[PDB]
C-alpha cells in the first residue's frame, strides 16, 4: 500500500464527485493528472491525486493556429 500511495497526494476525505472508492490495486493504474477516492488500510476512504501532473497548455506561449499572408 505504502509504495502505491507514494505516487499520490492525499487531498482529504472521500469526495463523492469523484466516484466510488477504488482499491489500492485499482488506484495503482490511475492515469496522470487524475483524482480518485481510495480505500486505504484499513477502513478509511480518502481523495487522492496522482503526483505526475499533465500539461498546463499555456496559451500565452502557444504560437498562432493560423497565418494570414500579408502583402510584402
Amino acid at each position: 500500500e505504502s509504495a502505491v500511495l507514494r505516487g499520490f497526494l492525499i487531498l482529504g476525505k472521500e469526495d463523492r464527485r469523484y466516484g466510488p472508492a477504488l482499491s489500492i490495486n485499482e488506484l495503482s493504474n490511475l492515469a496522470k493528472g487524475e483524482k480518485a477516492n481510495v480505500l486505504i488500510g484499513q477502513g478509511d476512504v480518502v481523495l487522492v491525486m496522482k503526483r505526475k501532473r499533465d500539461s498546463s497548455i499555456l496559451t500565452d506561449s502557444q504560437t498562432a493556429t493560423k497565418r494570414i499572408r500579408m502583402a510584402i
Binding site: 507514494r6 505516487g7 497526494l9 492525499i10 487531498l11 482529504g12 476525505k13 492515469a31 496522470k32 493528472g33 503526483r51 505526475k52 501532473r53 499533465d54 500539461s55 498546463s56 497548455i57 499555456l58 500565452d60 506561449s61 504560437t63 493556429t65 493560423k66 497565418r67 494570414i68 499572408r69 500579408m70 502583402a71
Partner: protein, 425 residues
Amino acid sequence: GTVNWSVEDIVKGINSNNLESQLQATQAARKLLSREKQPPIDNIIRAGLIPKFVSFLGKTDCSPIQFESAWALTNIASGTSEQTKAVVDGGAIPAFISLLASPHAHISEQAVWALGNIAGDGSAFRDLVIKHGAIDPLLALLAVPDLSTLACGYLRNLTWTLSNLCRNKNPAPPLDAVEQILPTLVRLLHHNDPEVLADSCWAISYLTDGPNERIEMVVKKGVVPQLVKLLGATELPIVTPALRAIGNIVTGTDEQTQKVIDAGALAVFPSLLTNPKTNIQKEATWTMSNITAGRQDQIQQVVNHGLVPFLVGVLSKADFKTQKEAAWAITNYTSGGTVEQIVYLVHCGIIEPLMNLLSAKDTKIIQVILDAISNIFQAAEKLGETEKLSIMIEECGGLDKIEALQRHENESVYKASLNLIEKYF
C-alpha cells in the same frame, strides 16, 4: 490596376465571361485580402465569391488565377472558425490537395499554406484534411536528399502545415497519420533553420501531449537527445516548444522519464530554472516536479546535477505560479526520497522559503506544503531529530503560520496543521 477595388467591382469581374477579366478581379480580391488589417473577409464571403475562387483552383491552364485564388482563400481561411468553415464548405480541401502537385513551387506552396490554416482550425478539420489524403503529397514535397536545396520559405511553410496536422488532442490525430508523419519530423528536427526547428519542436510537443502510449511513439523514434540539444538553443522560439516536449515526456512512465535524464537534460536546468522568460521558468519547474515524482535514483540525479539549490531559489523568489510548481517539486521529492535525500534538501535551505509560502491565498499550495513538511518530519523521526526540525521551523516564523492554519476554512488544511502542532509543537 488591381489596387483598391470595391467588392462590387470584384464581383462584376469574376462574373464576366472572360478569363482574363476574372483573373484581374481575383488579383484585386487577393490584394484587398492581403494589404490591410483588418481585411474585409466577411464582405468577400457575403458576396458569394468562395465557390468561384475554389473553381479557379482547378484551372490548370491558367496558373496565375490558381495562385491568386489560392492566396485569397488562404487569407479567408486564416480567420475565425466560421470563416475557415466557409472555405471548407466551398469544396476547397480536395482542390488544394490537387494543387500540391502544381509544377509551380509558388503555387504548391500556397496550397500547403491554405491546408495549414484549415487544419489549424481544430481537430475536426485537421482530420478531414487527413481523410482527403493530404499527407502523402505533402510528405512527397519533402522527399529530396538534402532539405537545404529547397527554398527556405517553402520548407518553413511545409513544416508549419505538418505541425498543424499533429496539433490538438480531443481527439489526438489518427495513429496511422502520426506514424506516417513522424519520420519526416525526425528529419526536420535536424534541419538548420530556426523556424523549421521551432515548428518541428512544436509538432513533437503536440504529439507528446497525451497518454503514455503517445509519448512512447515519439520516444521510440530516438528524438529525445535532439530535443535536449534544442533545449539549450539561444533562441527562445526553439527553447519554448523543446521544453514543453521534454516536460510532456516526463509526465510519462519512470522509463520514459529516464530517457530524458539519460540524454543529459538536467545539465540545462540551471539556466532554465533562472530564465528571464517567466513561462520558461514555470514550465522548467513543472518539469522538475514530474522528475522528482520519479524513482529514488532519478531524485539522486536531480541532487547530483546541483538542482536542489535552484529549486530552493525558485521557491524563494519567482512568479507565484512558478513557486507553486516548485512546491509541487518539493512534496514529490520528499514523498519519494530517501532519508539522506531529505536531509540534504533541508541542508540546502528548503525550510524557510517553504514556510514563507504558507501565507499564500491558495488552498492547493497549502496542502502541498503541509504534505512536504509532514514528509520531512517523518524523515526526522527516523533519525530521532524532530526537535531539531521543530526549532528550525519555529525560528523562521513557520510555527506562527501553521498555528494560524488551524482556523483555515478547508478541512484537510486545518486537520493537517492541527496534527503537526499536536505531534511536533
